[PDB]
Design a protein around this ligand. Structure first.
Ligand SMILES: [K+]
Ligand SMILES: [K+]
Ligand SMILES: [K+]
Ligand SMILES: [Mg+2]
Ligand SMILES: [Mg+2]
Ligand SMILES: [Mg+2]
Ligand SMILES: [Mg+2]
Ligand SMILES: [Mg+2]
Ligand SMILES: [Mg+2]
Ligand SMILES: [Mg+2]
Ligand SMILES: [Mg+2]
Ligand SMILES: [Mg+2]
Lengths: 102, 291, 25, 120
RNA sequence: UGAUAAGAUAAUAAAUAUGUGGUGUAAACGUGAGUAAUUUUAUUAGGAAUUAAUGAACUAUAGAAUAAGCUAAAUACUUAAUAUAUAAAAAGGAUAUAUAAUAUAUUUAUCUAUAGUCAAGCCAAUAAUGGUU
RNA sequence: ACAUAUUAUUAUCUUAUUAUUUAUAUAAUAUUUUUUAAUAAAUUUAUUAAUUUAUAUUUAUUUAUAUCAGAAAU
């Protein structure tokens, strides 16, 4: 679509790649701090630039959010419980309560 | 061993009892269930040995906390740590939140200033925890005869000892103190005298809403000389002896009032055989100032 | 036994009916 | 989507050539299990328009067959359409803008052609 | 705020799902061991006992949402109050605004009742491999 | 013959667990109930620990019946 305008919280692409997170700060060299490249490159271009499947989809979701004045704060992917997944929690908990508290 | 050590053990036993779970209270404190407790083998928190029977706990005496207050070393955080643990209990434990009386807070504020030397951190624990007292249905503790007067009295000594003379800080602090009072019942009338003395000392005109003029009504201890009845009566009126002696010593304007001197005569002559409360505290303030 | 008392009660009932058939026939 | 009775797409066809049944189904049953009712069919692949037609102004058409009357009955009894089915029903004029969401709300987009009900 | 800084209070911005809680796993998926039918299958314009104060979870409508206790605290749990012979309930959170914790408003939940939708229990008739050595 | 494996059955033996049903407790908890100390507050009342009292809910043991399973016989 159109190119949004830089804000004060997200002045440049590097700030954009740091707020979204998910290790997207490791693509700062792919974009070269070019604001237009971030808001013009689609999936096909990003795939040719070496961005993996998960990251390029995540970036494009945050680019759409920015274009619509929606928050771009990092949302973390889900993680299994400390005591393991439900299917292996009974076993893990039994072996963790006999080696920590006896 | 010492009076303080014994009092602390009694106060710590009382708290442990009321902080125990209700289901487990009959099995840990009723001696007839000592064998039922063993069999259940409930495991003491902190992964310690199974819980063991404890002696039944009976209502604690209000004098117990007065003994602990006056045992705290000259520069210690023991009173400040006990209060923070005592007032950290749930507001549903009525025994814990009703044990504290107006006398206890007066003795916690007068001991902290003249003996323990941590007044600032004792007026912050009381100011900070006043909201919990209201939720725990014990607002009376924050009154004018034990909380406000004691505070203004310690101010009339710190402002001198330290020489503080700002007329803005004093007024702001005086307003906060009055705002912290939840049981505004001026009886002795010493509050008005204390507030006026503060203004003269720090060169401002006090003006607090609701502090209506009250004539002096100092309780006169009778000439009759009893034993534990007059030792309690003196200890009962010990706070107002520290306020009468303070008023005269700080400012000579209070010498005008002759009611103040009558109480001094009565309280001093009542047990002049023993030491002087006012002087005793003054000595410590110097012994704490030197450090 | 409770199972030996139930068995005999049923065995007597079956034998009364087998006899009943003979008396009817 | 919520509820026990949902209007959703059941997948038919072959690999790489999906076609869908518009069905009323119990939430807990398999996607392609025999539903309560088959309301219609959805072919997601638009009909290809020829070079001339494109310049002529023909827009590719996606074809949906639907029982309008029966569909309205199931909405009336509290059946809950899926997001994709909701889009289809809003385009057909059965559902209105009350079923739109914040992400797809076309509050400001020009209308090039207005919904036209005809007979054929 | 605390006359010296330990703490408290509120606002804002974050963190925590190794604490207490809620919802979810009777489904789907896989398999064909058992099962020859008081149980399983299929069928019928079948039936009654003439099927619950059951909603499981959405729809429409109406009303309600009270007091204590227990836990560190609660939309946890327990005991009560009031609600279709009558019986049988509940829960707040978020955000604004005005007040001196309370009230409204918005939003999202909780409980009850009536109907609908989905969905259940039971029975009959008919048929369902081989051997009478 | 028979040595094996599998299954089923029982007027038999043993039996986990559970359901139901007995008897018992100076059993626990709550409330009621009879008193009794200790403590506290106030200047009788409250709390805690006991005792008496019934009530409900549990717990332990116990009686009987059924029961996974195993043994024996067929
Ligand atoms: K498989
Ligand atoms: K099979
Ligand atoms: K609300
Ligand atoms: Mg958790
Ligand atoms: Mg299943
Ligand atoms: Mg379940
Ligand atoms: Mg498959
Ligand atoms: Mg309520
Ligand atoms: Mg509550
Ligand atoms: Mg609940
Ligand atoms: Mg033969
Ligand atoms: Mg058997």
């Amino acid at each position: 679509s159109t190119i949004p305008k830089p804000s004060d919280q997200v002045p440049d692409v590097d700030a954009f790649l740091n707020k979204i997170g998910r290790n997207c700060n490791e693509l700062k060299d792919t974009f070269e701090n070019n604001w237009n490249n971030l808001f013009q490159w689609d999936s096909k271009i990003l795939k040719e630039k070496g961005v993996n499947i998960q990251q390029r989809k995540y970036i494009l979701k945050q680019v759409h959010n920015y274009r619509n004045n929606r928050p771009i704060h990092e949302i973390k992917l889900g993680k299994k419980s400390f005591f393991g997944g439900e299917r292996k929690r009974k076993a893990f908990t039994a072996k963790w309560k006999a080696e920590n508290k006896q | 061993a010492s009076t303080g050590e014994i009092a602390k053990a009694k106060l710590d036993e009382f708290l442990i009892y009321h902080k125990t779970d209700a289901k487990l209270k009959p099995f840990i404190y009723r001696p007839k269930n000592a064998q039922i407790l063993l069999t259940k083998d409930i495991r003491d928190p902190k992964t310690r040995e199974p819980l063991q029977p404890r002696p039944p706990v009976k209502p604690l005496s209000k004098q117990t906390l007065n003994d602990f207050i006056y045992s705290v070393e000259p520069n210690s955080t023991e009173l400040l740590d006990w209060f923070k643990e005592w007032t950290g209990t749930s507001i549903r434990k009525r025994a814990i939140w009703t044990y504290i009386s107006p006398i206890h807070v007066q003795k916690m504020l007068t001991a902290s200033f003249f003996k323990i030397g941590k007044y600032a951190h004792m007026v912050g624990l009381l100011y900070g925890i006043e909201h919990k007292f209201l939720k725990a249905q014990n607002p009376s503790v924050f009154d004018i005869e034990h909380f406000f007067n004691t505070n203004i009295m310690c101010a009339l000594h710190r402002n001198r000892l330290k020489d503080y003379k700002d007329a803005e800080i004093a007024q702001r602090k005086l307003q906060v103190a009055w705002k912290k009072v939840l049981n505004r019942k001026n009886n002795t009338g010493l509050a008005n005298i204390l507030v006026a003395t503060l203004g003269r000392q720090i060169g401002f005109t006090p003006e607090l809403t609701g502090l209506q003029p009250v004539d002096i009504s100092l309780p006169d201890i009778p000439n009759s000389s009893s034993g534990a009845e007059l030792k309690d009566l003196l200890s009962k009126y010990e706070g107002i002896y520290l306020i009468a002696r303070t008023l005269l010593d700080i400012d000579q304007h209070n010498a005008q009032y002759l009611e103040l001197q009558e109480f001094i005569r009565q309280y001093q002559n009542a047990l002049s055989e023993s030491s002087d409360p006012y002087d005793t505290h003054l000595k410590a303030l110097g012994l704490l100032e030197t450090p | 036994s409770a199972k030996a008392v139930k068995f005999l009660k049923a065995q007597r009932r079956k034998q009364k009916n087998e006899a009943k058939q003979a008396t009817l026939k | 989507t919520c509820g026990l009775v949902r209007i959703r797409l059941a997948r038919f066809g072959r690999k790489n050539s999906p076609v869908y049944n518009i069905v009323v189904a119990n939430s807990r049953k398999a996607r392609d299990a025999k539903p309560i009712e088959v309301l219609g069919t959805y072919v997601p692949v638009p009909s290809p328009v020829t070079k001339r037609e494109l310049k002529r102004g023909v827009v590719p058409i996606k074809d949906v067959k639907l029982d309008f009357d029966r569909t309205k009955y199931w909405i009336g009894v509290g059946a809950q359409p899926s997001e994709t089915v909701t889009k289809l029903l809003r385009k057909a004029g059965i559902l209105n803008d009350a079923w739109a969401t914040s992400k797809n709300s076309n509050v400001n987009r020009k209308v090039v052609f207005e919904r036209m009900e005809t007979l054929e």
